[PDB]
Amino acid sequence: SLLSQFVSKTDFESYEDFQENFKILVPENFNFAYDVVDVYARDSPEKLAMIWCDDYGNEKIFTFKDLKYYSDKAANFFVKHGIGKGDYVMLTLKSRYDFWYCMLGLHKLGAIAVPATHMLKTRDIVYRIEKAGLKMIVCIAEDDVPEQVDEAHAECGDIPLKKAKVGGDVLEGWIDFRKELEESSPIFERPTGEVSTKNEDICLVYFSSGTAGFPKMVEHDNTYPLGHILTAKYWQNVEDDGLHYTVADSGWGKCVWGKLYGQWIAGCAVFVYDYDRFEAKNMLEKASKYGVTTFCAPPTIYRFLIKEDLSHYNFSTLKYAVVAGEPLNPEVFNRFLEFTGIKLMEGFGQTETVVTIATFPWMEPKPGSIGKPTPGYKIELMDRDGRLCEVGEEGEIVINTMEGKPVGLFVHYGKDPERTEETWHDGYYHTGDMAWMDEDGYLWFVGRADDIIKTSGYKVGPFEVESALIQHPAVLECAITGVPDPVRGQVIKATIVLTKDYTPSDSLKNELQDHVKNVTAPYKYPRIIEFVPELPK
Amino acid sequence: SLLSQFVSKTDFESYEDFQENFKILVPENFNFAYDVVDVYARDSPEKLAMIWCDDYGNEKIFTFKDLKYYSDKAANFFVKHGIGKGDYVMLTLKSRYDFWYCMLGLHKLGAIAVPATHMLKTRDIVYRIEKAGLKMIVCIAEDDVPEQVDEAHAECGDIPLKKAKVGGDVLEGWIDFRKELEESSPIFERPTGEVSTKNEDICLVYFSSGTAGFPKMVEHDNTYPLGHILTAKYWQNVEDDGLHYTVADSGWGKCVWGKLYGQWIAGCAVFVYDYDRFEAKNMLEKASKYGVTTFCAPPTIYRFLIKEDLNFSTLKYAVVAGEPLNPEVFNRFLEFTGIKLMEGFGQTETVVTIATFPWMEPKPGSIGKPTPGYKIELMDRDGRLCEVGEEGEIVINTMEGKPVGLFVHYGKDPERTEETWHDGYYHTGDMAWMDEDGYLWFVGRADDIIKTSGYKVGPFEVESALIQHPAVLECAITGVPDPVRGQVIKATIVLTKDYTPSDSLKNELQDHVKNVTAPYKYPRIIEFVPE
Ligand SMILES: [Mg+2]
Ligand SMILES: [Mg+2]
């Protein structure tokens, strides 16, 4: 592995040793695709990078030599269609192996990758075209995505948006990605001089929900991949040798936390299972068969896995498992440990960061607690007056950046200096997450500082749902809030004032839920609706 | 002139006929630099495009051939420094003839021109760099502009921002624009295929004040220059081989309303007078000597002109826009010249939308009647249309499609775009009423935007500046009516524990705002309150 090249020291004897002695060593110029993937391709060509498979018996085994080859071809494909340094390209690719081709190709070119969920609806896509200034969309042919894109394109008018799809029939106005990719030269001339990437250049962007209005663009620089050394080597405890499996769709930040940067730096292969319908038994059988060694999933996924006879799939190779995204009930921890002999080690962070608080391998877990701060991240808890919190009091998790931006922290909200300044000022970046610290130094997440809702892993801005709801005739006014939930953390509640023409009923609730699911990504639908004569203001 | 190429017909007998029958014919693919400037450059090389001069003795006469030549050289200069299609480039060039080179060069590349005032301070420039994703700034060497840009760059970090200046000594990390332009090849090949421009491509962006927060990017597509056919031929009444003079700095939208697009389409040359301090006698003498035939200025300029004893024999037509017009200014100008000031109106987002056209008798103080193709309506709080005498918001009905000249969106701000343009109407935010004769009377903003001597100011631009001072705990910025200035900026301020109200403090707070943001925004009234 390349790990030792980027760190002060690889292994430590305790959390305290790790805190005192760990430093990421950032090279004068770092580009992940060139300095990790292409290095392996030359020095260890046959080293495994990725095991990919289907629910259709399709299997693709990628070495780093393979990934250099297809990412060079991908870079040329992008150049062919006028994509260059700084251009925003959206990727809606689920877990097609093409996602990895495109990411690496865009990194090589110095273009900007914008992964997005396949669940996006027309108005979501319009918003992202406009906010990012997208020059291209690369998407699956399935799930009516190209149709949603075309609808969005029509909304924007006859702009020169490039549209490439993976799979499917020939579509008028659409590029066939795989065909053109195969036709592309495997010789990509690395950009040099001023057109070459620098550490500070943006390479990756995620749209992330805010407390008011629509999702903001979290922009990450070329050193971001290095921050995931902490995520992969120290939190996930991956091994060169190994096969790491994080359950995450490419549309979400967790995909690159678990299926890309830090894993590959640490020399660990990644397992990708591109299924359409989650089946716990399918996931278990495939993961066991391919010999997955380390695992990450949200508590929801572990809930289904533990309802299966885990012992029947003698998951013999599983050596370490981590968890993040939803509240960890100790019962999930215990049942998993009783089946496997493995303790679920919880970690924490944000689209804007890498893992910032985690239960590291030298720590005994406190089931429910996110653990202790990651080295290099000066985590503090700040109250409403800008003062710091002592042990036992709730405050906002903030990151002290007075000595410089930690590796892995975002640069800004893209094209939004106002929101950036509001959230990051006077030497602290504000996560918007609330926690308290116990006497042992363990942190306990308590919720949001704002109106953002977290529902079984999904971060939801209330206005995303409110704006959808107000478009329905029956809605005069509405308020979207989260209500506590033991399993899902929170669920989305709509408090609605109906128009004169309508009366409250379960049927109408169904209709309004259905309306939301057709307007915006369906995970945002209000699970609880209450009809009221008036709202508080 | 190329006017007839772009319209259904040119001649009309009344406002009614014009409003009913005028239509712009938009080509399949239009790029102003190629389809207007380069056309004249080939078919009529010696045709006059621009007379440029100085307060310091300098004169430059530009034909269209000259302009093709230098804009081709400018395009290559931009390419050399990595500027291509869709790249935002800020131009802070006062009235240097270099503005024209750069604008046209950027159009040829399909890059995006962002003109800006020389008055921007560091924080203003940082904001624009970050909002636009600026890849280059081309600016004057004077007026401490390169210093403000350097401060801004330092604030942004090690970003790859190209910095080019016009004039001045060598600066570390700065490009010498004029030297490098002269070294650039005059051979430029029009980009084709994936690299070529389309009607829907953005070519021009202005930062424009909003009611809340910092200025928004008004983005205009490649067809926008055609909308100024209305502004130049019909409102300004320019003629083929005339000489049109609009008094406007290149940082502001009015410059392209008066010194570029519509004028050249109509075959009329533009007069550019790059002075540093305004002197009415100097302006009159230059305009007269060079033979200006048509004129536009804001009311403030007209007021200074009339305080002079007015031989301007070539002047045939004069228009006014940008500030409320007092009938006394109209009367005094008519008495001096025999020319009636014909008022027109619009926004950064549009071309001329309401005007006193040549067939109409002006009502001094009224902005006139709707431009053909702009379905101008007055709308109440209920989305209903207003009757005569009723104040409503000026809205533009776009249900039949976007009128030529209307902006595409607020760049990178779909939320603001949707808030202002939805359900078939673009909301201008300007309030007016219509009289019995159909003439429109402007009455103010629907929002908190302040307008002072023609300067649009978002209150938060001044509020954000003031709150940086230790003395200010809270503050509100509002407009108070002024007969000369339209409105003046007032700051109502709650002070901190350390400070005490005084005229010395007011002065320091005014000075502080002028150091932080463009100084035209300083609060002229300051009221200290307990709450
Ligand atoms: Mg480019
Ligand atoms: Mg760009």
**Parent domain of A509:** 450-537
Q: Which residues contact B133 (CB under 8 A, 6 or more apart)?
A: A86, A415, B88
Residues near ion ligand 2 (CB < 5 Å) are A 86; B 86
Q: Do A378 and A509 have their domain in common? A: no
Cβ–Cβ under 8 Å, residues B217 and B411: yes
Q: Do A85 and A210 have their domain in common? A: yes
Out of A135, A198, A415, name the one closest to residue B412 (CB): A415
Q: Do A29 and A169 have their domain in common? A: yes
Q: Do A463 and A410 have their domain in common? A: no
Residues in chain A with CB shorter than 8 Å from the CB of B205 are none
Cβ–Cβ under 8 Å, residues B525 and B464: no
Q: Does B424 touch chain A (CB under 8 A)?
A: no
Cβ–Cβ under 8 Å, residues B356 and B344: yes
User: CA B122 from chain center: how many Å?
Assistant: 21
| Interatomic CA distance for residues A112 and A105, integer angstroms | 10
Q: Which two tokens stand for residue A407?
A: 């590796």
Q: Do A310 and A353 have their domain in common? A: yes
Q: What is the DSSP letter of A195?
A: G
Residues in chain B with CB shorter than 8 Å from the CB of A420 are 130
Q: What is the dihedral of CA B193, B196, B202, B204, to 10 degrees?
A: 180
Q: Does B52 touch chain A (CB under 8 A)?
A: no
Q: Is A15 helix (H, G, I), strand (E, B) or coil?
A: helix
Say which residue the tokens 């902006």 belong to: B407
Out of B157, B408, B412, name the one closest to residue A131 (CB): B412
Q: How far is CA A76 from each of CA A33, A36, A101, A166, B153, rounded to the nearest angstrom?
A: 14, 20, 12, 17, 33
- A–B interface: beta-carbon pairs under 8 A: 61
Q: Which residue of A has its CA nearest to B82?
A: A195
Q: Which residue of A has its CA nearest to B157?
A: A200
Q: Do A276 and A406 have their domain in common? A: yes
Q: Do A284 and A406 have their domain in common? A: yes
Say which residue the tokens 């240097």 belong to: B96
* Residue finishing a domain among B411, B446, B481: B446
Element housing A41 (H / E) = helix A38-43
Q: What is the dihedral of CA A335, A338, A340, A344, to 10 degrees?
A: 50
Contact (CB<8Å) B158/A200: yes
| Interatomic CA distance for residues A535 and B8, integer angstroms | 55
> Which residue from B441, B170, B467, B455 is spatially nearest to B327, judged by alpha carbons?
B441
Out of B198, B412, B414, name the one closest to residue A160 (CB): B198
* Residue finishing a domain among B379, B412, B446: B446
End-to-end CA distance of chain A: give it in Å, rounded.
Answer: 57
Q: Which residues pair with B320 in a beta bridge?
A: B297, B343
Q: Do B487 and B339 have their domain in common? A: no
Residues in chain A with CB shorter than 8 Å from the CB of B421 are none
Phi and psi torsions of B361, nearest 5°? -75, 125
Among A130, A134, A401, A424, the residue to mutate for chain B (most B Cβ within 10 A): A130
A89 alpha carbon, closest ligand: 2
Chain A: give the shortest CA distance to residue B9, in Å: 27
Q: Do A439 and A502 have their domain in common? A: no
Q: Do B440 and B453 have their domain in common? A: no
B78 alpha carbon, closest ligand: 1
CATH of the domain at A374: 3.40.50.12780
> Which residue from A228, A203, A225 is spatially nearest to A355, judged by alpha carbons?
A228
A34 CA distance to ligand 1 middle (Å): 21
Contact (CB<8Å) B133/A86: yes
Out of A86, A131, A159, name the one closest to residue B200 (CB): A159
Contact (CB<8Å) A133/B214: no
Q: Does A159 touch chain B (CB under 8 A)?
A: yes
Q: Does A81 touch chain B (CB under 8 A)?
A: yes
Q: Does A415 touch chain B (CB under 8 A)?
A: yes
* Residue finishing a domain among A449, A483, A500: A449
| Interatomic CA distance for residues B443 and B433, integer angstroms | 8
Q: Does A135 touch chain B (CB under 8 A)?
A: yes
Give CA angle at A278 (A234, A305), nearest 5°.
55
Q: Do A170 and A302 have their domain in common? A: yes
| Interatomic CA distance for residues B287 and B64, integer angstroms | 21
A202 alpha carbon, closest ligand: 2
Q: How far is CA B304 from each of CA A23, B275, B282, B297, B332, rounded to the nearest angstrom?
A: 67, 16, 12, 11, 11
Contact (CB<8Å) B85/A82: yes
| Interatomic CA distance for residues B353 and B347, integer angstroms | 8
Contact (CB<8Å) A200/B159: yes
Q: Which residues pair with A475 in a beta bridge?
A: A498
Strands A528-531 and B48-54: unpaired
Helices (H), B327-413: 327-337
Sign of CA dihedral A461, A462, A466, A468: positive
CATH of the domain at B485: 3.30.300.30
Contact (CB<8Å) A417/B131: yes
Q: Do A181 and A207 have their domain in common? A: yes
How many Cβ atoms from other residues are within 10 Å of residue A57's Cβ? Answer: 6
Please, which residues 477-536 of chain A have a Cβ atom closer than 8 Å to chain B?
none
Contact (CB<8Å) A160/B200: yes
The per-residue DSSP string of B227-273 comes to HHHIIIIIIS---TT-EEEE---TTSTHHHHHTTHHHHHTT-EEEEE
The per-residue DSSP string of A99-166 comes to HHHHHHHHHHHT-EEEE--TT--HHHHHHHHHHHT-SEEEEESSTTHHHHHHHHHHHH-S---EEEEE
Residues in chain A with CB shorter than 8 Å from the CB of B200 are 157-160
Burial B371-384 (b: 16+ CB within 10 A, else e): bbbbbbbbbeeeee
Among B79, B161, B404, B412, the residue to mutate for chain A (most A Cβ within 10 A): B412
Q: What is the DSSP letter of B384?
A: P
Cβ–Cβ under 8 Å, residues B350 and B406: yes
Q: How far is CA A217 from each of CA A111, A129, B293, rounded to the nearest angstrom?
A: 15, 12, 51
Residue B97 burial class via C-beta count within 10 angstroms: exposed 0-12, middle 13-18, buried 19 and up: buried
Q: Which residues pair with A220 in a beta bridge?
A: A204
The per-residue DSSP string of B272-296 comes to EEE-SS--HHHHHHHHHHHT--EEE
B135 alpha carbon, closest ligand: 2
Out of B84, B126, B409, name the one closest to residue A130 (CB): B409
Q: Which two tokens stand for residue A4?
A: 């030792």
| Interatomic CA distance for residues A256 and B331, integer angstroms | 71
Q: Which two tokens stand for residue A487?
A: 């399993």
How many Cβ atoms from other residues are within 10 Å of residue A26's Cβ? Answer: 14
Q: Which experimental technique did the depositors report for determining this structure? A: X-ray
For residue A441, is it left (φ>0), alpha (ψ between -120 and 50) or beta?
left
Residue B138 burial class via C-beta count within 10 angstroms: exposed 0-12, middle 13-18, buried 19 and up: buried
Among B196, B404, B418, the residue to mutate for chain A (most A Cβ within 10 A): B418
> Which residue from B366, B325, B373, B323 is spatially nearest to B350, judged by alpha carbons?
B373
> Which residue from A86, A78, A185, A42 is spatially nearest to A414, judged by alpha carbons?
A86
B86 alpha carbon, closest ligand: 2
Residues in chain A with CB shorter than 8 Å from the CB of B175 are none
Residue A28 burial class via C-beta count within 10 angstroms: exposed 0-12, middle 13-18, buried 19 and up: exposed
Phi and psi torsions of A272, nearest 5°? -125, 120
Q: Resolution of the deposited coordinates, in angstroms?
A: 2.1
Question: Side-chain half-sphere of A335: how many Cα atoms within 13 Å?
Answer: 15
A136 CA distance to ligand 2 middle (Å): 12
How many distinct structural domains can be found in chain B?
Answer: 2
Q: Which residue of B has its CA nearest to A193?
A: B82
